[PDB]
Amino acid sequence: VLSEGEWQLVLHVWAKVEADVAGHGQDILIRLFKSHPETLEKYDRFKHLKTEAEMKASEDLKKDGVTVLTALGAILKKKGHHEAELKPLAQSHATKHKIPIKYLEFISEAIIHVLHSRHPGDFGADAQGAMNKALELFRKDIAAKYKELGYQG
Ligand code: HEM
Ligand SMILES: Oc1c(Cl)cc(Cl)cc1Cl
Numbered sequence: 001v002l003s004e005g006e007w008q009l010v011l012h013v014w015a016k017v018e019a020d021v022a023g024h025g026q027d028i029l030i031r032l033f034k035s036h037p038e039t040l041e042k043y044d045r046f047k048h049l050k051t052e053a054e055m056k057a058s059e060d061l062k063k064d065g066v067t068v069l070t071a072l073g074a075i076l077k078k079k080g081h082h083e084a085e086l087k088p089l090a091q092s093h094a095t096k097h098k099i100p101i102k103y104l105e106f107i108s109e110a111i112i113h114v115l116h117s118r119h120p121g122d123f124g125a126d127a128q129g130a131m132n133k134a135l136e137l138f139r140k141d142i143a144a145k146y147k148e149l150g151y152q153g
Pocket of ligand 1: 042045072099
């Protein structure tokens with residue numbers, strides 16, 4: 001549970017993401033793959049890419065960053081009332097992609113890093129704390145789903 005004020009701070013910084021969804025999505029994915037290379041092993045698509053410039057030139061990676069952030073943005077806008085949005089996401093990520101909760105922690109980290117790097121003025125401590133709680137609630141809810149689907153204990 002976040003307060004209305006905490007949700008506003010989340011949505012305030014997310015509006016800056018929506019000015020350039022693709023660019024943010026590329027920075028988030030590249031940060032994830034750099035910080036946690038094992039996550040890039042959930043792939044052929046662009047498993048192979050070796051330099052940052054190669055990563056930035058990949059159409060596939062750019063599409064993928066938009067796929068993630070579009071879906072996360074719709075979730076955040078629900079302000080916790082997100083069971084319908086998480087249902088299909090949990091289904092694919094538990095039963096087809098098989099993404100462990102620890103990878104969702106890794107991407108949450110990357111998200112926070114990029115937001116702080118790009119919008120420090122709209123991502124001070126209170127805003128950081130709100131985004132952390134929103135991303136935590138997401139993780140918690142998706143983990144309960146995963147188990148319902150028989151995945152990951
Ligand atoms: C905030 C976190 C996440 C959101 C909102 C998200 C959302 C999505 C959406 C909307 C799709 C396309 C539809 C679907 O298959 O359900 C998808 C596909 C996929 N996602 Fe996630 N995702 C995130 C976490 C992850 C993480 C941590 C990985 C780590 C490797 C990952 C890799 C997968 C893969 C491999 C696909 C298939 C992509 C393809 O078709 O080429 N996702 N994701
Ligand atoms: O690493 C990812 C890839 Cl390759 C594709 C999607 Cl759609 C989402 C994520 Cl987080």
